[PDB]
From Swiss-Prot:
Protein name, entry field: Lysozyme C
Chain's gene name: LYZ
Top-tier EC class: hydrolase
Other remarks on this protein: Lysozyme C is capable of both hydrolysis and transglycosylation; it also shows a slight esterase activity. It acts rapidly on both peptide-substituted and unsubstituted peptidoglycan, and slowly on chitin oligosaccharides.
Record bears the keyword Signal: yes
GO biological process, one term: defense response to Gram-negative bacterium
């Protein structure tokens, strides 16, 4: 499923993401935008280390979800990576919360540093009623 901007903004608020671990809704929106274009079935294989990024938040198979074929893998979030390809993003949200529970926080995603950090991110969640 490819979410429309405001529909995702409202869904994330309902799921308790606004201000989670100090992260504003606008930042989560900026992250989803650059990571997947708000697409829940987005997948990205990293030929270099053999790991795959899954879903709307592009969660990695080496530490956060299990896909069986990733070398030196662990399962912090304790999920099957398959759960991160559903139209319902409840599991992806739970996984994303787990990721930012580590000291690095939202910085865990390099894309966030390149495109969101230290910038005006209001535009991503503006006018959605959240």
């Amino acid at each position: 499923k490819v979410f429309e901007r405001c529909e995702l903004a409202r869904t994330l608020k309902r799921l308790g993401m606004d201000g989670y671990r100090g992260i504003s809704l606008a930042n989560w929106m900026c992250l989803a935008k650059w990571e997947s274009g708000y697409n829940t079935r987005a997948t990205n294989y990293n030929a270099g280390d053999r790991s795959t990024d899954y879903g709307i938040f592009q969660i990695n198979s080496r530490y956060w979800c299990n896909d069986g074929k990733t070398p030196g893998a662990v399962n912090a979030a304790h999920l099957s990576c398959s759960a991160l390809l559903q139209d319902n993003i409840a599991d992806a949200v739970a996984a994303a919360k787990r990721v930012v529970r580590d000291p690095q926080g939202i910085r865990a995603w390099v894309a966030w540093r390149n495109r969101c950090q230290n910038r005006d991110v209001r535009q991503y969640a503006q006018g959605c009623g959240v």
